[PDB]
Amino acid sequence: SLESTRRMLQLVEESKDAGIRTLVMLDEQGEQLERIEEGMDQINKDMKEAEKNLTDLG
């Protein structure tokens, strides 16, 4: 029975480490997502201005 508890302890420790790694990497993921979200708005605004200017010139 003691060996059983040892096995559960080891397994739960491993699971906790895996969860910790997932949390940190996902924090990085979210930072990247925020960066791309910031960029796309400027993309769209500049494109809209250029399209309106080109249409007006013609």
Binding site: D41, Q42, K45, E49
Partner: protein, 280 residues
């Protein structure tokens, strides 16, 4: 090698020559070239680790660009100036962020306005040790996000607002927000498991207002959410009510310590518990 001497020298030379160029203009290409050189000098100064000069150059470029019909470029330059000024003096960052928020809201979009409001609230809380203006900014951001059906960010902002209101002894708003958020999260396949926690927080607020009010709120919550009847928070609050109903402080302390042993209490929970204990 990244010595700042050459970077600073080049930046000041560029600034001086651009000032000379713009000054001569008493047709509009001069303003455009001046703004370009201003942006380049600001970037060079930022590379030189001097943030005040970079922010000043950014602000001057923003003003010059706004002098023309183009306005979104001014907003971009102003937000960059605020980011640069976040180090030395937050007041100028707040002013330029407010101006950028005004321009962006005038344009029509609001999500970026909400993000800038969140940034301003964070700056207020971190630097100016002020909570009321932070509360107002969080409320405005939450309203803006809810206007676009952005439930998660609005819920987080409302959570922060309710927490800060509770810190300031404004229990009614805190309980209202906590109840609303708990009810909203009860009907989700992922957030459901957290619906208990919020309720507990609200319940604690009731204890500050009165005892029988807290008991009735607990009964209402348990009836509304039967699964709340097995969580540790309900048992702790039942034990605290039992101890507090007969002027028993010893049992109160033993229950508090027993619960805290399993899980460490945060500043908010421990402060509220100390207040409740001091009540009687």
């Amino acid at each position: 090698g990244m010595d700042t001497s050459g970077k600073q020298a080049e930046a000041m030379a560029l600034l001086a020559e651009a000032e000379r160029k713009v000054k001569n203009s008493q047709g509009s290409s001069k303003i455009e070239e001046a703004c370009e050189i201003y942006a380049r000098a600001a970037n060079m100064f930022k590379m030189a680790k001097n943030w005040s000069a970079a922010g000043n150059a950014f602000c001057q470029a923003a003003q010059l660009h706004l002098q023309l019909q183009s306005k979104h470029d001014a907003a971009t330059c102003f937000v960059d100036a605020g980011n640069a000024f976040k180090k030395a003096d937050p007041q100028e960052a707040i002013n330029c962020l407010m101006r950028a928020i005004e321009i962006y809201t005038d344009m029509g979009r609001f999500t970026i306005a909400a993000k800038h409001h969140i940034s301003i609230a964070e700056i207020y809380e971190t630097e100016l040790v002020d909570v009321e203006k932070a509360i107002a900014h969080y409320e405005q951001s939450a309203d803006y996000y809810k206007g676009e059906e952005s439930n998660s960010s609005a819920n987080k902002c409302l959570l922060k607002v309710a927490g800060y209101a509770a810190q300031l002894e404004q229990y009614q708003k805190a309980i209202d927000i906590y109840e609303q958020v708990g009810t909203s999260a009860m009907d989700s396949p992922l957030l459901k498991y957290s619906a208990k926690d919020y309720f507990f927080k609200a319940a604690l607020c009731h204890f500050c207002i009165d005892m029988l009010n807290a008991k009735l709120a607990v009964q209402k919550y348990e009836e509304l959410f039967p699964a709340f009847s097995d969580s540790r928070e309900c048992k702790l609050m039942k034990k605290l009510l039992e101890a507090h109903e007969e002027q028993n402080v010893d049992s109160y302390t033993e229950s508090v310590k027993e619960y805290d042993s399993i899980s460490r209490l945060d500043q908010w929970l421990t402060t509220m518990l100390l207040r409740i204990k001091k009540t009687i």
